[PDB]
């Protein structure tokens, strides 16, 4: 779902950037490791939605931090 992979990619890169903005070193490969996905480009939609839940929660927590 190239539209989903762009949304997922934008959020995971946003999460990486926010971590770096927080001063916490962040790399895309690690945030992909959080999703434990082997290929972001090819994934089932439900997994993109499931991944979002992980990133959004994490993104919000650094906000509180």
């Amino acid at each position: 779902s190239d539209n989903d992979i762009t949304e997922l990619e934008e959020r995971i890169n946003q999460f990486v950037n926010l971590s770096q903005e927080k001063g916490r070193d962040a790399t895309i490969d690690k945030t992909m490791r959080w999703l434990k996905i082997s290929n972001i480009n090819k994934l089932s939609q439900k997994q993109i939605a499931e991944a979002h839940q992980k990133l959004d929660a994490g993104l919000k927590q650094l906000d509180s931090e």
Partner: protein
């Protein structure tokens, strides 16, 4: 027993570095030995310090014949629910897991000057995961039978304030090590993917071992 270095230099007003420059003893070792935490001491060190401070070892070594030996349960009554609240994303012990309960028995064989030794049993249960900082937390335990061990408290408070603090340290350190050991065997590694402050990435293991659980009871107030 404990060296009174901290009390000695507080009374003198001198600093550890100043003493180290005077007695030619390594700053790190001397500052560690200044704290009662160090368990080993050198004869050269006691000679140099006693001479520098112009005092006999009497003032250097605070000794009380009442020996408090502590033993812990080989198997405790511990339940640790695992809550997967993004420990990796947030390095907080609460995010990694939570102690449902942690109760066990701490046997204290208090020994007077005479070989006569009195044993006190402590039903100690986990009470709360106190959050000292946003970064780390301290587990807090409580003695259910502390009222029974009122005589133990009488013996604890019968010692000097410095020796009382040394016991509290020893109890806290043993308890921390024990709790961290149990938890690290019960909880899988939860590595932190993103380092906080980019300084280092720490696995939950490093956090729980770093976590220092200090027992809280009227038996041990200070």
């Amino acid at each position: 027993i404990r060296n009174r270095l901290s009390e000695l230099l507080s009374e003198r007003g001198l600093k550890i570095s100043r003493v180290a420059k005077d007695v030619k003893i390594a700053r790190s070792s001397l500052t560690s030995m200044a704290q009662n935490d160090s368990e080993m001491i050198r004869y050269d060190a006691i000679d140099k310090l006693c001479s520098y401070l112009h005092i006999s070892p009497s003032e250097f070594f605070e000794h009380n014949p009442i020996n408090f030996d502590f033993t812990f349960d080989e198997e405790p009554n511990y339940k640790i629910n695992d809550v997967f609240e993004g420990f990796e994303v947030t390095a907080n012990i609460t995010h990694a897991f939570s102690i449902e309960n942690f109760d066990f028995e701490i046997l204290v064989d208090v020994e007077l000057d005479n070989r006569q030794k009195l044993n006190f049993d402590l039903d100690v249960s986990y009470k709360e995961t106190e959050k000292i900082t946003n970064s780390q937390h301290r587990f807090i335990f409580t003695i259910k039978n502390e009222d029974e061990n009122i005589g133990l408290k009488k013996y604890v408070d019968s010692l000097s304030a410095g020796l009382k603090n040394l016991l509290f340290k020893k109890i806290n350190q043993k308890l921390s090590g024990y709790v961290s050991e149990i938890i690290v065997k019960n909880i899988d590694d939860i590595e932190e993917l993103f380092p906080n402050k980019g300084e280092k990435s720490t696995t939950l293991h490093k956090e729980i071992l770093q976590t220092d659980s200090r027992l809280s009871s009227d038996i041990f107030k200070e």
